[PDB]
Write a protein that binds this ligand. Structure first.
Ligand code: EMC
Ligand code: EMC
Ligand code: EMC
Length: 297
């Protein structure tokens, strides 16, 4: 029951081991709070151009137990939020927490497959944080997103781009990462253009710099060990430059031609904004609508 994304560090912290902190949160609770603050910060950068007063409906198409679906709805009482998660236990837990907070009239989580089951509404904002690289059928997913996106709406993604000639695929973990060109055409095919693309790769690599991790996790139960090894592999691919971890802010441009959307997306991906730049801009603007950092007392 936490934020489960990787997080950006401006610098490597010597001695800091992400695997020990993530996998032993009861032994390193205050370090886990340090990580949480960076998880929150990265989400703030993702959301900091949205006007939540204008938003009326939000979809999270890989909502896990529904963290943002619940928090957005409780922070903004005029918003209705929907979440899709493939995991039955996560939907049940999310809908329990929705009930425990009396948000059932405005927040609802569905145990459904975002690449196959049609989203039930039209949304002003659609969020997918570390979702789409777990999904094999990319066109089904982005057909679903585009068809449920209001004309003036935004799609917000946190996802990987492959910097290789071909996509980066791994069937045993069912991970598929499109190349730059594949992203250009996938978005353009479904009427979507990149408004902003922010590269977090160096800062994610700083946080995941964990030199003994492969030895450490061999001292953990096979369950744990099997789970975390995908974070290790992404760490390795990030360090090598094979993939990039990015924040996507997309808009719909349906009255525009495919070729024109393609050229736009190409220009944007050739000049990704460094995360420190986007973060400094957010801080200097003073506008940080969601999430808020937790504070003592
Ligand atoms: C992978 C935890 Hg910042
Ligand atoms: C090379 C523009 Hg799609
Ligand atoms: C204008 C900073 Hg999000």
């Amino acid at each position: 029951e936490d934020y489960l994304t990787v997080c950006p560090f401006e610098r490597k912290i010597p001695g800091f081991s992400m695997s020990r902190v993530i996998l032993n949160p009861e032994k390193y609770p205050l370090e886990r709070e340090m990580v949480r603050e960076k998880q929150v910060e990265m989400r703030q950068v993702l959301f900091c151009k949205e006007n939540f007063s204008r938003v009326q409906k939000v979809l999270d198409f890989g909502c896990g137990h529904g963290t943002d679906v619940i928090q957005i709805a409780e922070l903004y009482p005029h918003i209705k939020t929907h979440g899709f998660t493939i995991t039955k236990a996560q939907a049940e837990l999310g809908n329990q927490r929705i009930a425990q907070k009396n948000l059932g009239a405005r927040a609802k989580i569905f145990n459904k497959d975002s690449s196959k089951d049609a989203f039930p509404d039209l949304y002003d904002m659609i969020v997918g944080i570390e979702v789409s690289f777990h999904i094999r059928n990319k066109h089904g997913l982005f057909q679903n997103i585009s068809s449920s996106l209001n004309e003036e709406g935004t799609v917000l993604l946190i996802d990987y781009i492959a910097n290789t000639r071909g996509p980066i695929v791994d069937q045993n973990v069912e991970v598929s990462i499109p190349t730059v060109q594949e992203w250009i055409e996938l978005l353009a095919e479904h009427q979507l253009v990149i408004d902003e693309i922010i590269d977090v790769s160096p800062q994610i690599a700083n946080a995941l710099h964990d030199p003994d991790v492969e030895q450490y996790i061999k001292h953990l139960p096979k369950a744990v060990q099997d789970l975390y090894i995908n974070t290790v592999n992404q760490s390795i691919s990030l360090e090598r430059g094979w993939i990039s971890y990015c924040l996507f802010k997309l808009k719909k441009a349906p009255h525009l031609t495919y070729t024109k959307r393609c050229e736009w997306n190409a220009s944007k991906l050739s000049k990704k904004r460094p995360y420190p730049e986007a973060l400094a801009e957010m801080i200097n603007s003073g506008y940080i609508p969601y999430p808020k950092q937790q504070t003592r007392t």
